[PDB]
Amino acid sequence: LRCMQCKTNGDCRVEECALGQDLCRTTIVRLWEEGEELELVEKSCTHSEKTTGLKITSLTEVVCGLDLCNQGCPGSNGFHNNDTFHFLKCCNTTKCNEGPILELENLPQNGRQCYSCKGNSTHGCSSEETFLIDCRGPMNQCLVATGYMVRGCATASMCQHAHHIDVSCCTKSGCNHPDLD
Amino acid sequence: SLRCMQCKTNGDCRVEECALGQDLCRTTIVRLWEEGEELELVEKSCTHSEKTNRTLSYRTGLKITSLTEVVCGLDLCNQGNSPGSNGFHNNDTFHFLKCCNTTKCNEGPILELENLPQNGRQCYSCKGNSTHGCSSEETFLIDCRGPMNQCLVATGTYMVRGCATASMCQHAHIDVSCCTKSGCNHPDLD
Ligand SMILES: *[C@@H]1O[C@H](CO)[C@@H](O)[C@H](O)[C@H]1NC(C)=O
Ligand SMILES: *[C@@H]1O[C@H](CO)[C@@H](O)[C@H](O)[C@H]1NC(C)=O
Ligand SMILES: *[C@@H]1O[C@H](CO)[C@@H](O)[C@H](O)[C@H]1NC(C)=O
């Protein structure tokens, strides 16, 4: 028996089916969501045989203001600083949250304010380069991490272990002031 | 200031406060028709008419695709871990690599090993190591398929034999030797 074996962007063949493959199949998968319509059609040989993972998505964003400066589980946790933003979402595929992740500049701010800095203790996260920022979105705790030092806004999910490479979190505005670590 | 519907594919569909300089709302519909594929994307956003040519024009990259395939005949043996094209296809494993300039690109497919036709050449096959994996008890003759019509040997400071495309044979160097007539990569011919 010979069937059309054709994927989109795969090998499209006239195929001699294997012994025990007594059927030709054509399948049409259609998908409708907001601002997307997709139709795939595959053909192949098949046989009547009688007889769950997790998804992880991550956004990382860096902003800058100078000229041409951009050149070169079931839970979510993010950290968003004032220069860089990192969010990580993880779901069980049976019941998954496909809601999008918004970049830093689109998150509404939450009212929290935290100090922000990056780099080594003495330079980069001195209290000369450390400045207060408004937190945005779900990152409503103030975070310090050291292992080098980073400060910013964080979600509670990112504060709960706090282990090496250690993190400290606190729930009140300004609480990550540099000589309070 | 201006506010537009901002909607992406699989993304954040918002009502957006546009930037001061953004005087336009954009709606964009991209449609794609290929053999056995139809796609429609709709993205809405804020935009601005930027006048003449934007500074220091544009760029054009390279697209590179690689297929790697392993077969086995044993029971649940695929459990897990446990500007041109060149391929090598062995008897167990197949690796092909295609490279194109996006302006003139060959979107032709890469076919798995079992669907490529035999080309008539036959070469020896083994991988891994002299004592184990490329003994001449573990070295077998195989029919080559598709564009892989050369017999290849390679070794490094590990050894593999198989069928190879001329693209994979045109220089040595971790050393490679190729030959064009059947059986010529026999271990007693190195
Ligand atoms: C996902 O959730 C279902 C119940 O909702 C459970 O039976 C299944 O084992 C879960 N899978 C994973 C990978 O957590
Ligand atoms: C691609 O090829 C065209 C001519 O075929 C050439 O003008 C162009 O510069 C090439 N681009 C790259 C990135 O190689
Ligand atoms: C070949 O067998 C294993 C690798 O599969 C390795 O331990 C062994 O040392 C190799 N033989 C020689 C002579 O290196």
From Swiss-Prot, chain A:
UniProt KW Membrane keyword: yes
Domain UPAR/Ly6 intervals: 1-72, 112-181
Keywords associated with the record: Cell junction, Cell membrane, Cell projection, Disulfide bond, Glycoprotein, GPI-anchor, Lipoprotein, Membrane, Receptor, Repeat, Secreted, Signal
Summary of the tissues where the protein is detected: Expressed in neurons of the rolandic area of the brain (at protein level). Expressed in the brain.
GO cellular component: cell projection; cell surface; endoplasmic reticulum lumen; endoplasmic reticulum membrane; external side of plasma membrane; extracellular region; extrinsic component of membrane; focal adhesion
Gene Ontology terms: biological process: blood coagulation; chemotaxis; negative regulation of apoptotic process; negative regulation of intrinsic apoptotic signaling pathway; positive regulation of DNA binding; positive regulation of epidermal growth factor receptor signaling pathway; positive regulation of homotypic cell-cell adhesion; positive regulation of protein phosphorylation
Disulfide linkage: C3-C24, C6-C12, C17-C45, C64-C69, C73-C90, C91-C96, C114-C142, C117-C125, C135-C153, C159-C169, C170-C175
Positions bearing carbohydrate: N82, N92, N120
GO MF assignments: enzyme binding; protein domain specific binding; signaling receptor activity; signaling receptor binding; urokinase plasminogen activator receptor activity
Compartment annotation: Cell membrane; Cell projection, Invadopodium membrane
Transmembrane domains' residue ranges: none
Role played: Acts as a receptor for urokinase plasminogen activator. Plays a role in localizing and promoting plasmin formation. Mediates the proteolysis-independent signal transduction activation effects of U-PA. It is subject to negative-feedback regulation by U-PA which cleaves it into an inactive form.
Record's subunit section: Monomer. Interacts with MRC2. Interacts (via the UPAR/Ly6 domains) with SRPX2. Interacts with FAP (seprase); the interaction occurs at the cell surface of invadopodia membrane. Interacts with SORL1 (via N-terminal ectodomain); this interaction decreases PLAUR internalization. The ternary complex composed of PLAUR-PLAU-SERPINE1 also interacts with SORL1. Interacts with CD82; this interaction prevents PLAUR from binding to its high affinity ligand PLAU.
Protein's name in the database: Urokinase plasminogen activator surface receptor
Gene: PLAUR
Range within the parent protein: 23 to 299 of 335
